[PDB]
Subunit: 95 residues, 4 copies
Amino acid sequence: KDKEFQVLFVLTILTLISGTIFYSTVEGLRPIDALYFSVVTLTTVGYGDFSPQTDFGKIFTILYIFIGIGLVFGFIHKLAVNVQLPSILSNLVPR
Amino acid sequence: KDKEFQVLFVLTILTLISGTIFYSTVEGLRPIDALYFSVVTLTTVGYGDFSPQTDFGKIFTILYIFIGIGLVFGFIHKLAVNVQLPSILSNLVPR
Amino acid sequence: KDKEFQVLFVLTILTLISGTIFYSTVEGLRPIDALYFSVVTLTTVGYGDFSPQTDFGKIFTILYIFIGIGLVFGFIHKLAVNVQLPSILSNLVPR
Amino acid sequence: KDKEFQVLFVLTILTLISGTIFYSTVEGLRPIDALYFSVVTLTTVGYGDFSPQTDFGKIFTILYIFIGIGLVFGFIHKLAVNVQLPSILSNLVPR
Ligand SMILES: [K+]
Ligand SMILES: [K+]
Ligand SMILES: [K+]
Ligand SMILES: [K+]
């Protein structure tokens, strides 16, 4: 279960690095903005303060969403159930 | 399970084609933008760089969301569990 | 299961009517725009082509989201599993 | 189950207070706008009428989303199943 978490963590980082490199390069964003945009996209928040302007970028974004959402939300689920929940329970019992 | 995936894949493509034809025609978008907008809508990202301006478009979008979200997210779930997950597991074991 | 669906359908309509009346009145939107905005909000798409400008509207929106998401997505789930899925299966078998 | 709900309720309030203090301070928002923005972010609506403009804010938002979504949606789930659903069932049976 901690190996579950480690693998999803690594896969999430790799997915976000991919988006960061793509949007910096093709859409001209600063790397920090490309990372922020990738996260805002795959978590489905979608502020729209950044959005792709090129057709290459729009096509990549379609594929990136379909491939990336399942992973990101898998990681969020495991983070909440396997890390946050036990730490919350631990705080309820003094030692 | 591969037939599960094939059917949801075909249904997702048909749903996206419907949106592409509607928004190109009624809202005047380029076909690639109409496809991109349909995906950004049904995955609930919603950047808002495109949004419907006509009342016909707003009404269609209401119905398209309610009909389309369940399918799209069904496909994403099956993609992640039935395709991405086994390929990830396969990479962990050399042959 | 059809009574499950009927009840969630009615509750979803009532929830959307509430939002339509509120945003038309307090935020000055046309009724069709208030309905469209309510749907775009509770399905979490959030284009931002409309958003509340008054403090009353921002406060209402906070509460409306927390109360409304669970219902709307309950209805979407039942629509997809109890209505769309059987109709899709029915199309695969000629009579 | 009512203690389940109480704990998630308190944790949700604390999470929203954190965001309210951060975005008011670093991004200069009025407290009510910072609260509204925090809710619009963690429920994944993401209108984009507010969005972070500083790099500190963008970095915080990335972490806030990953930590906050699992909690918020846990609370929404329990609200809908453990509070809204029984009250709806209660209305169907006069006394
Ligand atoms: K969303
Ligand atoms: K959005
Ligand atoms: K969104
Ligand atoms: K937006």
